[PDB]
Amino acid sequence: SATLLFQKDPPANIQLFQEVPNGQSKEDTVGRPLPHLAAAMQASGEAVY
Amino acid sequence: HFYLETHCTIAIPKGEEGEMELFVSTQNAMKTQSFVAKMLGVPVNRILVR
Amino acid sequence: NKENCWKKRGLCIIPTKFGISFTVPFLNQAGALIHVYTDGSVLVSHGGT
Ligand SMILES: O=C(O)c1ccccc1O
Structure with missing residues (x-):
């Protein structure tokens, strides 16, 4: 192994979280993975710093 | 009126x-806000009149 | 580690606990200002950034 050049290994990503109550309204986003509200503008460069 | x-x-x-901030010489900030919003087609909370 | 002389692997599992609250009591206060405009749209303002 001391003669081997760096070899990157295959990545693996798993996230586990809890789903919201089965009877929760579609408009009640508390507990849901809602993306950051400014993420689209951040990705487009429209978000103002 | 002839206001100077x-x-x-x-x-x-x-x-x-759709955010916009306006500086206006007006006695009606509210109507200025809703009217600008209506013309733009965005919610009133997107417009700030000062 | 037995099959490798110049490369080794390590493994460790550790816990953590973190007290929640400013340790300066008076900093644990928050304010918010909410306006509902006539078109029904809401504008929320709070002390956080
Ligand atoms: O974490 C704290 O206890 C704290 C206390 C005062 C000011 C900033 C802080 O983060």
């Missing part, structure tokens, strides 16, 4: 979510 200062407005477009 005539009508004047400065509108600043932020570029985010």
Whole structure:
């Protein structure tokens, strides 16, 4: 192994979280993975710093 | 009326979510806000009148 | 580690606990300002950034 050049290994990503109550309204986003509200503008460069 | 200062407005477009900030010589900030919003087609909470 | 002389692997599992609250009591206060405009749209303002 001391003669081997760096070899990157295959990545693996798993996230586990809890789903919201089965009877929760579609408009009640508390507990849901809602993306950051400014993420689209951040990705487009429209978000103002 | 002949107010010494005539009508004047400065509108600043932020570029985010239809946001706009305006500096206006007006007695009605509310109507200025809703009217600008109505014309733009965005919710009133996106417009700031000062 | 037995099959490698110049490369080794390590493994460790550790816990953590973190007290929640400013340790300066008076900093644990928050304010918010909410306006509902006539078109029904809401503008929320709060002390956080
Ligand atoms: O974490 C704290 O206890 C704290 C206390 C005062 C000011 C900033 C802080 O983060």
